[PDB]
Amino acid sequence: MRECISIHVGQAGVQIGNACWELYCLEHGIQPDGQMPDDSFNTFFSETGAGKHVPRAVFVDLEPTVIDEVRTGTYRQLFHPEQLITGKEDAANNYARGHYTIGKEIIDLVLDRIRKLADQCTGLQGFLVFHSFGGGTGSGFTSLLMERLSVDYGKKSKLEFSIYPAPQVSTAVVEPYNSILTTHTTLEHSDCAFMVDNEAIYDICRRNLDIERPTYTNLNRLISQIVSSITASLRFDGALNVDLTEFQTNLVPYPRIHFPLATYAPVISAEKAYHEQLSVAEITNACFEPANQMVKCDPRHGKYMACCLLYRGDVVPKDVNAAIATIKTKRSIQFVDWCPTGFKVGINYQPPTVVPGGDLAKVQRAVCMLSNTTAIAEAWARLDHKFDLMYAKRAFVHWYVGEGMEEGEFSEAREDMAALEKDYEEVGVDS
């Protein structure tokens, strides 16, 4: 019944996967061994003959290090060994190595494992793909896998949770190249993609959680909370829900304009105890503050095409509508002329769950706003400009060419990005 398969690619994807699955277990009362003493959780967890609950997920990395930590870790019994796939040689922050050279060896094995999970599904909805834009595996292997998934799965829904690179935490000079190459190749294969800018997450951890030097552990716990908010509607049956198809129908007006901006609230530090309880009005107001965004950009300089508000916990429809009405009186929120109905609201009964010993405080109510704004084009522009700086001099190009890539693939990828930026511009013009 309505199953969803989660694929975690590369270090970023695997590490975010660890955070997501830890949070899902806390939310559904599943122990780290898969034991549990609704029924919708079955969309994400299958059940074995021993009454154990197993994530409907595949973890893939071209290097074994990251995944070796999962198979030694607290949740080693949660996953069956066959769903934790590792190679020997990494993609060395090279899209060409991930996509071609190294990727081509493991691709068939990864798809065989995905096929085995799909065979356990009676009503497979589709896939959730987690990866970084910057790493060779996250970029190169993901686009290779996405292409192969379109072939094997027909017209099956594929949603992404993409880690947009940040210099505060960046590991490679070539991340703009890998980002553009993966976006070009994956664009025609993805139905909806939620970008997560590591700088936005880094700044929220610093500002809201008072963490001087945020680590991936800090970043992922926060990321996991947003992913859980998007997936709560699939894993639970509330008063107001949204399936794989309804997300896309409400937020995606055109094929290529499939990049919603996520905004989450409240993000409160586990200290204090006075900084709560926030009302529905207060958390809704926080969604329109650029400081709570998952991608750095300015919506006041762009136009909205769709706004989805996903509430969780002690929330009443009357409270929500009152909050939306006051926000509508703040003229500053501009929508495209071809869009009337701006607000689609969903309420899921379960209050946000937090990891014990975590940085996040337990709240009675939270909200995740998914908005399709033309302001997200600003994130593409930043990436495209960094690509252009290096590409004008063909700096580092030899690394890709050496692996069998052609220079033409770089031109093609960049022209496609130029067309994407042009698409966001065309969409914001009035008729």
Add this chain to the structure above:
Amino acid sequence: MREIVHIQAGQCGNQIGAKFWEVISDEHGIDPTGSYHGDSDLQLERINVYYNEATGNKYVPRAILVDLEPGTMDSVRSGPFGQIFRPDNFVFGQSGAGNNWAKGHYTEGAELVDSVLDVVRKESESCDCLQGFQLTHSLGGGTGSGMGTLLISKIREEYPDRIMNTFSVMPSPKVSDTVVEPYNATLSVHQLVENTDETYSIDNEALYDICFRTLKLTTPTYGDLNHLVSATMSGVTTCLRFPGQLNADLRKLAVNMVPFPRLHFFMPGFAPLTSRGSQQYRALTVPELTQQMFDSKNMMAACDPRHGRYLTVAAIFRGRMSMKEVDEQMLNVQNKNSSYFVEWIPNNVKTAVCDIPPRGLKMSATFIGNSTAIQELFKRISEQFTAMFRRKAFLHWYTGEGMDEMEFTEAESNMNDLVSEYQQYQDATADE
């Protein structure tokens, strides 16, 4: 990506290589018998990058020791950590190279090369996932220089997809054992431009100047110079041998450091500067460590970084310090010294911090820079070369080995092109 195969060639190569192994063994808590006696799990986490685990608790360097002369090998075996090395891994000739690149590259070296490749193949086929090779040698001699570059070419033939890394020591008139060093160096530079993925340009001119001027050692010995080499080698390899995010393997380092194939010559830097005896010392804070990145006084290549521009920089901080302070200080230096970093390579300075400091120091900093100022080192070699070549002085030593004048003209022209290439990117602008 796991194992690195280390090769030591010639007098200099073996001397520096032996010191590298005693330094890193001490850091990884390995005694001269191969037994681990440390008390930190970080020491063993990535031990497999440089050591093979032999039967039981013992660790053996994945090192091949090469020379055309037997004496140096005997000196290594006799040494402090001499017993740690794999007996079968010592490959030595009887007929030396006599500080003649032609003997090392074409004659005597060619005769020994196959016996060396046989030992490197044994080590390589034992590997789960070979990253590549690391060669320590001098460019002024005959074995390290001529045979070393011959080995690079032969290894490249058999392992064309592995990373080729070198620690190449540049000759200097300040600490010269032969008048023909400019010829040997030029002939070797020609080979490295074409055959390595990354070369750490270790300049004896800079090492002598540091010892004499900074360490106040009136008469520096190779032991004094090698103490600086081993401190640098320990620093630049920190990322490969301890758990880390940045430049964790040879390929990732190369991919982040090398924008153009031929521009793979690194200018290493180190702070604080210490002398063998100096176990004092009481100094070095984070702002202090960071300031020495632009300090010509701290460069292992005799070039002023302020005479050029950095294409890419890797900076490794070691010891117990604030990661926040490091990030602030590093950003301050890039903002203050904007003009010494290329604008067309965004976020080109990458930093890593390792909790384990090197021996004797509580805090240290290692810099790996890909700077256009490295052209000063190559210009120096070209002018020394031309002064001799103009008069065809000592050419009989090379032609007598079967070499032709053209090879000399070609090596020189290739090296001048390399200088011209650094100058081209020094003058390049982000006008796009």
Add this chain to the structure above:
Amino acid sequence: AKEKLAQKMESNKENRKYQEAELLKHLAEKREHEREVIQRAIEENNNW
């Protein structure tokens, strides 16, 4: 989607196999010089 996948990979081996054989072509060329000089080294000598 089959000819887009196969043809992108047609160009991969066409490239990567050649871009490590353009390599070994000169690695032939320099050993073509090893004993082009080594024997010249005897034809100078076993000639005087």
